[PDB]
């Protein structure tokens, strides 16, 4: 349904073992399209899909420099956090940020978001109003006072309502080919003779886009997620996604079980049996 533009920043302090590492990745829905990494041999903002390269040189110039500034500010913020939590200058630490915007049907902001984590735990988050902040602890409260004084929420709101959705609108036409078409899953059921008191039924979903999907198993109509193994959705490596759901059934009751697949690329809920 809704389309999104999102950026993910990771900053890793390597304390007196170098300089701070910074990597940024950009996504339009579940498709990555740019990347920057300052531990890379030659840090530059690079394309990662074909369509994004039909952009001009000005784009790569602006984006490269902007993320290069952001990386230095994050190297600063890592040591600021170091101080807030009163931590030593020797152990490595992590600062993550994710932000982005979802487009409504009208072509304007449905909702925007911006959240940070320090060492894998919630730090500070912009609330859905794009005007107030939720701080997880009293160090994030220091950061929140700073951002209240600088009226930072208004800066983020201006970005999320303007440049974010405008960039997303343009990206959604440069990559019209693959961004605005859904790929339904290619599904099949696999049988494994495990023992003589159980065979394993595996329901596969391959080559689907976007990432969200529902895979469940039923017997004569009732759900069996209570005894079902469900792997985390994983990338195929070509921009699509894979998943499977397996369960143990008695030998001879294979037809008694059905796999149910739900995905926006399908016209109606899919049902599957081992054949």
């Amino acid at each position: 349904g809704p389309h999104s533009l999102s950026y993910f920043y990771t900053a890793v302090s390597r304390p007196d073992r170098g300089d701070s590492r910074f990597i940024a990745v950009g996504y339009v829905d579940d498709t990555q399209f740019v990347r920057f990494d300052n531990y890379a041999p030659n840090p530059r903002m690079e394309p990662r899909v074909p369509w994004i390269q039909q952009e001009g040189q000005e784009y790569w110039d602006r984006e490269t420099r902007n993320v290069k500034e952001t990386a230095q500010t994050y190297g600063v913020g890592l040591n600021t956090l170091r101080g807030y939590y009163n931590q030593s200058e020797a152990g490595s630490h992590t600062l993550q940020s994710m932000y982005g915007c979802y487009l409504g049907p009208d072509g304007l902001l449905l909702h925007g978001y911006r959240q940070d984590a320090y060492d894998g735990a919630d730090y500070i988050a912009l609330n859905e109003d794009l005007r107030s902040w939720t701080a997880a602890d009293m160090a994030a409260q220091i950061t929140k006072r700073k951002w209240e004084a600088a009226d930072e929420a208004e800066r983020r709101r201006s970005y999320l309502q303007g440049l974010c959705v405008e960039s997303l609108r343009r990206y959604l036409e440069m990559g019209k080919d693959t961004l605005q078409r859904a790929e339904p899953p290619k599904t099949h059921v696999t049988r494994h003779p495990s023992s003589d008191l159980g065979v394993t039924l595996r329901c596969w979903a391959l080559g689907f886009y976007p990432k969200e999907i529902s895979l469940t198993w039923q017997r004569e109509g009732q759900d069996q997620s209570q005894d079902m193994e469900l792997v985390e959705t994983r990338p195929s490596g070509d921009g699509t996604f894979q998943k499977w759901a397996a369960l143990v059934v008695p030998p001879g009751e294979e037809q008694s079980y059905t796999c149910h697949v739900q995905h926006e690329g399908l016209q109606e809920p899919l049902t599957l049996r081992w054949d």
Binding site: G26, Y59, E63, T80, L81, T143, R155, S167
Partner: peptide, 9 residues
């Protein structure tokens, strides 16, 4: 397009 960083932590 990425956002400009406007505040420190």
């Amino acid at each position: 397009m990425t956002a400009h960083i406007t505040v420190p932590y």
